[PDB]
Design a protein around this nucleic acid. Structure first.
Lengths: 143, 98, 97, 49, 141, 49, 104, 48, 81, 216
RNA sequence: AAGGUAAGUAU
């Protein structure tokens, strides 16, 4: 039914989002922002900050690929995976790319973006202390 | 705290004065100190806007920014010192006074 | 300092000669990076670091961490007992604590 | 003058009207050690109160 | 301690002192194996990049290169000397010896400040500069 | 007659936020109590830690 | 020449005066470092097993070691100079107003 | 001294500029510190 | 598929709209900044010793420090054993 | 008295294979030349043991890839990789290194496991917090035994009956033991005078220090 | 016993 969307988030998360959306057709006719919040629960915070009890997090946020990133990058991961899943669902609802070529391409793009986020920082030059100077310096006036 | 609380401005004035007590004998100002003291002056200039922001934070704000920690090196034992954001500091000070 | 010198000498001893010219400082940089990651209580993992060199650096960091903790605690005991100390040693001890 | 705890001269202070709403100030002065890095040698009292 | 450039004979030391016309030539006389020299060399290594605009740091072994032992009284475990435009720049550290730093420092900023003071004084054309910090005592309390 | 003087050891470090919030509901508004208790659940930073 | 002979004679004399306990104290020192060495091994010895495993590191692995890059951004590494400014005049005004007292 | 308090200066420059209060204090009481009864030792005549 | 250039008035194939626009509005300040940067990083003298020199210095240290290296342990400064 | 109750119950036999290693700075050709000498060749030492000392892997020094420190987990067979012909364990003495291999030859009727939780580092004594995952009902040690001794030892399955667990810092050490009441499947945790019924699953989650196993 | 050298240019 959804060969492309299965590749990205797996069949279990696919089943959950398809069931909660009301259908593959209903899933496709839905923006990626709403799909990311599919399955979200307004969990009560019991004397804790709203950050501790993950808000605005749905099935995609708890998917295997999204949960595999460090917690400081899981929001961007959830957004990107939700966008690509929306694209795959729109492709799937028309029963195109039944092989999964669109799904494989989207998963490869997601993995490349995740690797870029995990990329080690580049070498950054150390700025030496400025040499002391005694020459006169002319400075402008005005307002 | 009611919107038309009678003692609302007195508590805000006390909180702002307590926040400014850290610079009473200061001679130089850090950029962070400059910004915080400018926030205090702005809150004093427009007490009602500051009170409205405080009520909005008390009603809706549940997530806060990180707090910096340092330790006063008393030779017997370390005493934690916490650095809260100035925007949240005003709300906390007013809440404590009230 | 003695531990860092020993680790650097051991690692550079079995490095191929043709590459010691341009990579002697890189391994010291990796060693310092691992140490500062341990100080920051932050995970340290270099994907391109070979496993034997990674284990060598891990052992270095473990030994340095033991020495660092013991030095911090001994210095703090000296501070509490009233031992005559300077401001720089107290600042370093406060940071370590 | 200069007798009593609190001092009599505190009655003539110009901030008496606003200091009457300062409640729990002594615990605040003792709790200021966790906010300001400097150590207060007068943690036990407030000059205005 | 081992990352700094080394000078292996007196002629190299003379050339290093002569080569730099716009930077202070900081030369540490001692042994890489001496603990005091290890501390001083670690301090110099921590600041080597920072002061590279107005200072260059070299290390000399006084056993491999004994050509300056009698001249500069290099009979201490560690010794740091400052040269600017082929002139030895003395510094009034308050220790009674104004010609060298014969102990090991612990603060990078301390050594950087001393280097900066030497650089400024030597640029103005002075043979003696006054250290920003006195060392008649170790300030231990 | 006996004089006992002591301390509540680890008083601050052992305060549960859920129990503190639920006890604060008893004396203040549920919104104020939630704000005060959520304020203690913040990220603590020191240099790179 | 004869200066070297005199120096050698005096040095040999000083060495001979040291033979009273030289071998005894040197064997005691040998037997004393080894007592200390078992409890506190040499630093290089503690890395001997790890060093041995560096032999099988291929030359390609040796080259492929990455460089260390700082994670701090421009603001953290090289912050702009932080200016210091005097406290506002309102502080002096409020300090001098504090000393004012009512007459009733 | 006031003007330099708010200028961009290095640590050595600021350390040098914190000594003027000490110099003023020392010269204010100079007829007392600079005494042979206080500092027992030899005398050095200031040049010029 | 030629689209008129809004900055030069010429025509470019649609496959090169974005790159032509990005290159066309490239400040020469970028060129001079890059030239300055190239001049700076190719003229600063190296501060630390080369790798072979580091290895030689560490070898000398190991020779003269037998309390850390070697099998036999001589004094701190001696090299015989 | 060679055969006492303690010897017949707990004492087993293991074979030690020791291979001395030359100095690391020695050249490869000279190392091979010294390989001809019997000093650096394998030496067989057959010595009986009262208990088996299992050494844990070094505790993790950093956090995981997800910025959250994780309690180390090790399979029982991973710390049981000792006492077999394949694993070679380096012994770094203060003077020379050795490659001491261990080979089990005689399994005692009751086996005692002593996990080295406390090791003294270069400056103080540290406790290894590594948690060992071990089944408490079926472990087979026939693989570790030699082909010559597996025929005589037809029984190798061991069942845990007791597990001494150390909790806390070495200075403020606390000792608790999870005993198995014979005749019932219940497990009892014995902390001082307090006896608490503990489910069999919770035992493996504790820092095991001393274990005793029954062949049955 | 020290922490108490002005840095010079000329003769």
């Amino acid at each position: 039914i959804a060969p492309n969307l299965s590749i990205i988030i797996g069949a279990s998360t696919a089943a959950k989002i398809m069931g909660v959306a009301g259908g593959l057709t209903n899933l496709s006719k839905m923006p990626a922002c709403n799909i990311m919040l599919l399955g979200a629960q307004r969990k009560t915070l019991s004397g804790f900050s709203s950050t501790s009890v993950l808000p605005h997090t749905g099935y995609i946020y708890h998917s295997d690929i999204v949960q595999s990133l460090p917690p400081d990058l899981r929001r961007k991961a959830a957004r990107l995976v939700a966008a690509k899943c929306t694209l795959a669902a729109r492709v799937d609802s028309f029963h195109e790319s039944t092989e999964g070529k669109v799904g494989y391409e989207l998963k490869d793009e997601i993995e490349r973006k995740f690797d870029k986020w995990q990329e080690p920082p580049p070498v950054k030059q150390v700025k030496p202390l400025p040499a002391p100077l005694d020459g006169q310096r002319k400075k402008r006036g005005g307002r | 705290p009611p919107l038309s609380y009678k003692h609302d401005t007195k508590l805000l004035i006390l909180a702002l004065e307590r926040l400014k007590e850290a610079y009473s004998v200061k001679s130089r100002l850090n950029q962070s100190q400059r910004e915080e003291l400018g926030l205090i002056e702005q809150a004093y200039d427009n007490p009602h806007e500051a009170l409205s922001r405080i009520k909005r934070h008390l009603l809706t704000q549940r997530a806060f920014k990180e707090v910096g920690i340092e330790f006063m090196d008393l030779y017997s034992h370390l005493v934690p010192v916490y650095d809260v954001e100035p925007l949240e500091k005003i709300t906390d000070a007013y809440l404590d006074q009230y | 300092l003695e531990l860092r010198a020993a680790v650097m000498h051991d690692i550079l001893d079995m490095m191929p000669e043709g590459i010691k010219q341009n990579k002697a400082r890189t391994i010291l940089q990796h060693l310092s990076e691992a140490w500062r990651c341990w100080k920051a209580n932050i995970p340290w993992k270099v994907p391109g670091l070979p496993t034997p060199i990674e284990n060598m650096i891990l052992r270095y960091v473990k030994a340095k961490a033991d020495w660092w903790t013991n030095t911090a605690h001994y210095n703090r005991e000296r501070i509490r007992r009233g031992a005559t100390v300077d401001k720089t040693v107290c600042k370093k001890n406060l940071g370590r604590l | 003058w200069d007798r009593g705890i609190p001092r009599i001269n505190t009655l003539f202070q110009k901030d008496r009207h606003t200091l009457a709403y300062d409640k729990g100030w002594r615990v605040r002065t003792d709790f200021k050690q966790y906010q300001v890095l400097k150590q207060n040698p007068f943690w036990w009292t407030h000059q205005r109160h | 301690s081992y990352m700094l450039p080394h000078l292996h004979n007196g002629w190299q030391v003379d050339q290093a002192i002569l080569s730099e016309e716009d930077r202070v030539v900081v030369i540490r006389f001692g042994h890489d194996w001496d603990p005091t020299c290890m501390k001083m060399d670690e301090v110099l290594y921590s600041i080597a990049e920072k002061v590279k605009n107005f200072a260059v740091i070299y290390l000399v072994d006084i056993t491999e290169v004994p050509d300056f032992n009698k001249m500069y009284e290099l009979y201490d475990p560690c010794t740091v000397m400052f040269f600017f435009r082929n002139k030895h720049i003395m510094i009034d550290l308050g220790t009674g010896n104004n010609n060298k730093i014969n102990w090991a420092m612990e603060d990078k900023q301390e050594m950087v400040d001393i280097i900066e003071t030497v650089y400024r004084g030597a640029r103005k054309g002075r043979g003696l500069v006054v250290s920003p910090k006195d060392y008649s005592t170790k300030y231990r309390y | 007659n006996v004089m006992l003087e002591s301390r509540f050891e680890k008083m601050y470090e052992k305060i549960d936020l859920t129990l503190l919030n639920r006890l604060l509901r008893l004396i203040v508004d549920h919104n104020i109590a939630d704000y005060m208790t959520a304020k203690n659940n913040v990220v603590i930073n020191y240099k790179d830690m | 020449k004869d200066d070297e002979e005199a120096d050698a004679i005096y040095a040999a004399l000083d060495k001979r005066m040291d033979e009273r306990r030289k071998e005894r104290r040197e064997q005691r020192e040998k037997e004393e470092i080894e007592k200390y060495r078992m409890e506190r091994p040499k630093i290089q010895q503690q890395f001997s097993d790890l060093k041995r495993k560096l032999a099988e590191v291929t030359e390609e692995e040796w080259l492929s070691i990455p460089e260390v890059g700082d994670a701090r951004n421009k603001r953290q590494r090289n912050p702009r100079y932080e200016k210091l400014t005097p406290v506002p005049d309102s502080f002096f005004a409020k300090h001098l107003q504090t000393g004012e007292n009512h007459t009733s | 001294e006031e003007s330099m308090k708010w200028k961009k200066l290095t640590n050595a420059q600021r350390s040098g500029l914190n000594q003027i209060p000490n110099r003023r204090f020392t010269l204010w009481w100079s007829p007392t510190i600079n005494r042979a009864n206080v500092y027992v030792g030899f005398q050095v005549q200031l040049d010029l | 598929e030629y689209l008129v250039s809004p900055i030069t008035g010429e025509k470019i194939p649609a496959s090169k709209m974005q790159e032509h626009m990005r290159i066309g509005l490239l400040d020469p300040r970028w060129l001079e900044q890059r030239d300055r940067s190239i001049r700076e990083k190719q003229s600063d003298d190296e501060v630390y010793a080369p790798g072979l020199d580091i290895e030689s210095s560490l070898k000398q240290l190991a020779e003269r420090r037998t309390d850390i290296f070697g099998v036999e342990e001589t004094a701190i400064g001696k090299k015989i054993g | 008295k060679k055969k006492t109750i303690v010897t017949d119950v707990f004492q087993g036999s293991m074979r030690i294979f020791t291979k001395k290693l030359p100095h690391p700075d020695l050249p490869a050709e000279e190392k091979e030349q010294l390989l001809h000498n019997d000093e650096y060749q394998e030496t067989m030492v057959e010595s009986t043991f009262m208990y088996l000392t299992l050494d844990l892997p070094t505790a993790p020094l950093y956090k995981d890839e997800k910025e959250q420190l994780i309690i180390p987990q090790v399979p029982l067979f991973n710390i049981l990789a000792k006492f077999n012909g394949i694993t070679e364990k380096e012994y770094k003495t203060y003077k020379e290194n050795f490659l001491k291999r261990f080979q089990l030859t005689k399994l005692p009727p009751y086996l005692i496991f002593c996990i080295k939780r406390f090791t003294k580092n270069n400056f103080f004594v540290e406790k290894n917090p590594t948690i060992v995952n071990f089944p408490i009902t079926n472990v087979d040690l026939r693989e570790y035994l030699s082909e010559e001794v597996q025929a005589v030892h037809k029984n190798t399955t061991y069942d845990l009956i007791a597990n001494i667990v150390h909790d806390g810092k070495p200075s403020e050490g606390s000792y608790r033991i999870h005993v198995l009441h014979h005749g019932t499947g219940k497990w009892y945790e014995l902390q001082d005078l307090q006896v608490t019924d503990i489910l069999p699953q919770m035992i493996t989650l504790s820092e095991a220090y001393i274990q005793i196993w029954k062949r049955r």
